[PDB]
Every structure is written in structure tokens, then in C-alpha cells.
Amino acid sequence: SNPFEEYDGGHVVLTDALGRHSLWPAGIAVPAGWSVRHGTDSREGCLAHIEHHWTDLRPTRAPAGACVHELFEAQAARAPDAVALLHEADELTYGALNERANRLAHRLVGLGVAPGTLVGVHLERGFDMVVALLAVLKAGGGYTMLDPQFPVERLALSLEDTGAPLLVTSRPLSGRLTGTTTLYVEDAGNLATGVGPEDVACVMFTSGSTGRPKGVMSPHRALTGTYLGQDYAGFGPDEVFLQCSPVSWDAFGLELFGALLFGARCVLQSGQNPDPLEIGELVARHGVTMLQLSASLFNFLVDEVPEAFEGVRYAITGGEPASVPHVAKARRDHPALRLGNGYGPAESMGFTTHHAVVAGDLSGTALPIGVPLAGKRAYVLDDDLKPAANGALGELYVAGAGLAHGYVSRPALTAERFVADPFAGPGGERMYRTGDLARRRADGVLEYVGR
Ligand SMILES: Nc1ncnc2c1ncn2[C@@H]1O[C@H](COP(=O)(O)CP(=O)(O)OP(=O)(O)O)[C@@H](O)[C@H]1O
Ligand SMILES: [Cl-]
Numbered sequence: 001s002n003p004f005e006e007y008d009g010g011h012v013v014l015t016d017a018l019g020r021h022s023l024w025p026a027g028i029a030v031p032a033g034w035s036v037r038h039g040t041d042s043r044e045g046c047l048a049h050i051e052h053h054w055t056d057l058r059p060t061r062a063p064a065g066a067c068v069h070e071l072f073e074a075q076a077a078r079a080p081d082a083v084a085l086l087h088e089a090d091e092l093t094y095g096a097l098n099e100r101a102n103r104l105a106h107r108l109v110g111l112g113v114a115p116g117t118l119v120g121v122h123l124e125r126g127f128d129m130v131v132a133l134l135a136v137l138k139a140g141g142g143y144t145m146l147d148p149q150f151p152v153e154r155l156a157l158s159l160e161d162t163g164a165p166l167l168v169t170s171r172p173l174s175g176r177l178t179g180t181t182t183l184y185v186e187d188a189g190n191l192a193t194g195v196g197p198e199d200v201a202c203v204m205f206t207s208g209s210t211g212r213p214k215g216v217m218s219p220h221r222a223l224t225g226t227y228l229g230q231d232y233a234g235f236g237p238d239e240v241f242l243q244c245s246p247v248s249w250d251a252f253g254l255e256l257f258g259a260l261l262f263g264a265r266c267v268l269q270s271g272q273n274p275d276p277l278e279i280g281e282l283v284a285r286h287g288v289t290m291l292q293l294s295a296s297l298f299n300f301l302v303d304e305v306p307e308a309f310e311g312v313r314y315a316i317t318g319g320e321p322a323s324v325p326h327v328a329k330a331r332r333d334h335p336a337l338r339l340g341n342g343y344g345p346a347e348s349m350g351f352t353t354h355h356a357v358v359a360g361d362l363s364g365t366a367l368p369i370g371v372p373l374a375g376k377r378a379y380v381l382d383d384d385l386k387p388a389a390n391g392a393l394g395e396l397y398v399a400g401a402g403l404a405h406g407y408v409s410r411p412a413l414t415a416e417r418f419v420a421d422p423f424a425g426p427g428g429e430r431m432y433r434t435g436d437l438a439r440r441r442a443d444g445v446l447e448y449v450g451r
Contacts, residue, residue, distance in 0.1 A: 001383040002395065003028065004416050004433060011046045012039030014420055016428035018059035020406075021050045021415040028385060031420040033428020047412040054411035057217060058116070058200065065197045067220040068257060069137035071228075073098060073190050075263040082237065084260060086286055087126050087268040094263070097131065102188035104135035104168075111166060111183065115140035115195045118164040118203060118408075120180065122146040122155065122173055125247060125268050128185045130256065132168045133202075137220075140193035142200035144215065145248040147207060149272035152176050158205045158213040161409045197221035202253075203408050204346055207246035215408040216250070222349040225375050225401030227258045232340055232354040232373070233290050233314045237263035242288045244269040244279055250346035251318065254292055276300050280308035287311055292342070294319035299326040302333070309334045316340040318351070321448060322367035327357060343369035343448060347418070347432045349402035352376050353446055369438070369448045376400035379431065380440045385422055388440065393449060396438045399424075399431040 009027040014034040016022075024030065026040045038049040066074075075082075080095025092100075113119060119136045121143050123129040129145075136143040144162050146155045156177055159167070167180040174184075201220040205213055227235065233254075241259040243266055245251035259266035267286045269278055274297050282288060284307065291312055293301065298317040301308045309315060309330060315337055317327065322341045330339060344352030355361075355370025372378045380394040381387060388394030399421055406414030421429040437449040 002433070003383055003385065004419060007043070010040045011043045012041070013037045013046045013049050013415070016420070019054075020059065020418075020430065021054045021411065022418070022420040022430070023047065023050070023416045024420060029422065031422040031428065032424060032426055034420045047416065050415045051412045054415065057406045057408065057411060057414060059198060059405070063197045063221075065221065065224055067137065067195055067197055067199070068201055068223050068261065069134055071224070071261045072134065075260065079237070079263055082263055083265050085127055085130055085266050085268060088270060090127070092127050097127075097134070098190075099188045100131045101134035101138055102190060104131055104185065104187070105138035105191050106188070107183065108135055108139040108141070108166070109191065111181070113139040113141045113166065115193060115199050117141040117166070118144060118162045118200070120144050120146050120159045120162065120164045120167040120177070122148060122167060122169040122177055123185060124148055124170070124173070125243070125270065125272060127268070128170060129247065130268075131187075132185045136168075137201060138191050138193075140191075140195035140199065142202050142217070144203040144205070145252070146177070147246060147248040147272055148173060148176075150207075154210075154213070158215060161213050161215050162203050163409065195220075197224065200405065204250055205248050206346070207249050214410070214413070216346045216404045217406060217408040218349055218404040222402050222404060223253055223257055224261070226350040226373065227254065227261055229375070230373055232342065232351060232356070233258070233316065235262045235264070239264035239289045240267060240287050241265070241290050242267045242269065242279065242282055244274045245292060246273065250350055251292060254350050258290075276305055276308070280305040283308050283310065283312060290314045290316075292316050292318065295322050296320065298330075299323050302326045302330045306333050309337055312337060314338045314340065316342045316354075317367075318342040321450070324362065324364055324367050327367060328362040331357070331362060341367045341369055343446075344398065344402070345432065345434050347404050348376065348398040348400075349404070352398045352402055353378055355445065366447065368441075368445045370445060372398075372400070373402070376402050377431075378446060379423070380438050380446070390442050391439055393437055393439055396434040396436045396446075397431040398434060399429060403430060403432060
């Protein structure tokens with residue numbers, strides 16, 4: 001049961017100082033920082049109000065932090081000749097990648113890209129893909145990765161939701177997506193567009209569904225908030241990450257930016273889906289130091305490609321409930337391997353919580369999802385939005401720096417899931433309703449139960 005879906009006493013619409021809208025049950029106290037803009041009304045009536053009024057999701061003390069491309073730029077200045085990307089037998093240095101992305105960024109500016117502009121990127125995995133998305137960020141826009149493994153009808157639909165007036169693609173992919181002004185990625189100082197951390201960096205669309213497109217629109221701050229100042233993996237110039245996760249959803253960022261923001265190497269896997277045998281070969285070839293793997297992929301590699309973990313420093317299972325026996329076996333086979341369980345919705349960006357595996361876990365029936373990343377929060381709430389007592393079952397709501405702005409072109413859906421945070425201080429903040437059931441145990445660690 002959930003009071004944002006079914007509530008006895010009807011609903012109201014709340015807004016904060018940044019013009020963001022939240023659905024809210026009428027019988028529950030209004031959180032600090034929020035004011036009633038509409039209602040009491042029926043749920044459908046509240047949602048209609050939101051659809052009509054909330055026409056721009058972007059929010060309307062100086063912002064802390066550099067943007068994603070700015071941190072990349074500093075790494076490119078620090079070590080222009082360090083290797084940034086590896087793909088098949090080819091390598092691309094930080095310096096060369098920065099120069100290519102600059103050339104393309106200047107082209108984007110001439111075509112009208114500005115802060116607040118979105119740009120579709122329809123490219124197979126390889127250097128051009130990274131040149132293109134960095135170029136979009138540098139020009140101050142947000143990118144949306146259009147994964148070419150998907151049917152064009154679905155890609156076209158997603159692109160339409162974003163409203164992007166520009167598409168970057170390749171000569172071989174030319175003509176698949178039509179009706180949007182298109183430029184070609186095939187090939188230079190840094191730009192200074194005034195873009196900031198609350199500006200949109202990306203819109204993500206899931207690789208794992210055939211339902212109606214849902215574009216998660218997230219600011220630079222949500223990316224940097226997930227990869228900087230964290231300790232769930234090793235970050236630094238001596239790391240070698242492997243970009244094998246689907247390019248258009250949220251696991252992509254850790255692999256690509258977790259490397260580029262730090263001066264590390266990023267190996268790009270050929271093919272749009274994680275390829276277990278190729279992963280094993282790439283780890284051996286390049287000395288990959290961190291793997292991020294969905295649980296099913298993790299379990300297969302542990303059982304059938306054990307050499308994929310040789311030399312690897314951190315492996316993190318995610319996306320679905322971890323298999324304790326496979327985590328245990330990984331530990332037996334690779335004693336120096338640090339193991340983690342990473343949890344979260346794309347709406348809160350990459351990992352919202354993380355659990356470092358300890359010996360005492362390896363005999364359990366389930367692996368805990370751990371504690372929130374620095375700057376992020378997780379609540380376990382009952383259907384009155386009251387925290388669950390210790391060990392009691394409740395629903396997970398997540399909050400803090402990873403939160404997306406919402407779902408592009410879908411303000412009603414955004415307002416029913418990104419809702420007011422009733423625990424936050426004077427400033428109004430939001431929390432995202434995950435739909436996941438969990439328990440918090442005495443020591444504060446979170447246990448995923450399911451849906
Ligand atoms: N480490 C982990 N352990 C268990 N479950 C996990 C997990 N990491 C992710 N999940 C599950 O996978 C989900 C990932 O969230 P998302 O990718 O945002 C789902 P979505 O595509 O937005 O669709 P939905 O929320 O409408 O189902 C989590 O909500 C959780 O159910
Ligand atoms: Cl150098």
C-alpha cells in the first residue's frame with residue numbers, strides 16, 4: 001500500500017521554491033519548504049493540475065562544484081598523453097579526446113546548442129560515442145544516448161519525449177532516425193558556456209523494457225555526486241574500468257565517468273550488451289581493476305569465466321538481488337577481490353546505497369544493500385510515511401544528491417514519484433518513491449526484500 005497511489009482523504013498539489021510540483025495525500029502534514037498550490041481534490045484532478053502547470057521540470061548561495069566535462073578537462077590538462085579510452089586494438093589519449101570533443105562542441109554551438117538544449121546521440125559503442133557526449137556537455141547541453149540495439153520506433157519515441165532539436169549519428173547509422181536535424185560525429189580549445197552543476201547533463205532511457213518511454217533527466221550534480229567523494233570503489237589514474245553496461249541507462253556513468261573524472265583508463269566493449277566472454281578477454285588484455293556487473297552476469301562470470309576476476313580489485317554486483325553463493329565463491333576463488341552490492345534506481349543515479357561484503361555475510365540467504373553513499377539518503381517508510389521501526393518491513397524512499405530533475409515531458413508522473421521529503425529542514429527537498437520493500441536492521445544496514 002502507498003498513499004501516493006491510493007489515499008482515503010484525497011490529495012493536494014504542493015510546490016516548492018524552485019517551482020517543482022509534488023502530489024501529496026491530504027491527511028498528511030505538509031513538509032517544510034512546501035506550500036499547497038491546489039486541492040483538496042481527487043488524485044486524477046491533482047495530476048491534471050500538474051500536467052497543465054508544470055511545463056518545465058528544470059528548477060527555476062552559489063552552486064558548489066565543477067561540471068562533468070570541466071573535471072574531465074582538468075584531467076586532460078594534467079596528463080594530455082595519458083590513455084583515456086581503449087577500444088579493440090586502438091587507444092585515445094586524454095589530450096586527443098579533449099581536442100576531438102572540443103572540435104565537435106564548437107560545431108554544436110554553431111548549430112544552436114546552448115545550456116538547456118538536449119542532443120540525441122545515436123552511435124555504437126566506441127570512441128565517437130564518447131567524443132559526442134563530451135562535446136554535448138562542453139557545449140552546455142545534455143545528451144541522450146540512443147542505443148542502436150533498440151528498434152528505431154522506440155528510439156524515435158524516446159527522442160521525441162526529450163524534445164532534442166539535434167541528433168549526432170554516424171554514416172553507417174544515417175537515415176535510421178529521421179526528422180531531426182542531424183550532424184555527423186566523424187572528425188579546438190575548451191568552451192566556456194556558463195553551464196553549472198544544476199543544469200541537465202543527461203536523459204536516460206532503460207534498456208530493460210518495452211513499456212512507454214520514461215526519460216530520466218539528471219543534472220551534472222547527480223553524476224558528480226555519485227562518483228566523487230565516495231569510497232565504494234577505487235577511483236584514480238591507476239584504475240582501468242570496463243564500459244560494458246548498457247549505454248542509455250544509469251550504470252553507464254560509473255564505468256565511463258568514474259574513469260574520466262579521475263584520469264583513469266576506460267575500456268570500451270564492442271557490442272551494445274555486456275558480453276561475458278569478451279569481458280573475460282578484455283580484463284586480461286587491459287588489466288581491468290573494477291567490474292560492475294548485474295547479478296546474473298556476475299553469477300555467470302564467477303561460475304564459467306573465473307579468470308575475468310584475475311587482477312580485478314573491486315567487483316560490484318547490482319541491478320537485482322545478489323546471489324550469496326556466487327559472492328561466496330568469488331571470495332574463495334579470488335581472495336584479494338573486494339566485493340560489493342550496489343543498489344538504487346536510475347532516478348537517484350547509479351548506486352544510492354552500497355554494501356561492502358564482509359566474511360559474516362557469506363553464510364546468509366541474502367546480501368544486504370548496505371548504507372547510503374555520502375550526500376545521499378534512504379528511508380524505510382510505512383504507508384503513513386512514518387519511518388518503520390527497526391527490522392519492520394517498509395518501502396524504500398531515496399533522497400539527496402543523486403536525484404534526477406524528473407521525467408522529461410511527464411510532469412504528472414514526476415510529481416507522483418519525486419515527492420516532498422517530510423523529514424527535511426526549512427528548504428523543501430524531495431524523495432523518490434522506489435516501489436521497493438526493505439528492512440533496516442539495528443546497525444542501520446538496509447536489507448532489500450523485493451517488490
Ligand atoms: N543491489 C540490488 N539488489 C536488489 N535489487 C536491486 C539492486 N539494484 C537494483 N535493484 C532493483 O532494480 C531496480 C533498479 O531501478 P530502476 O533501474 O530505476 C527500475 P525502472 O527502470 O525505473 O522501472 P520501475 O521502477 O518502473 O520498475 C531497483 O528498484 C530494485 O528493484
Ligand atoms: Cl602528458
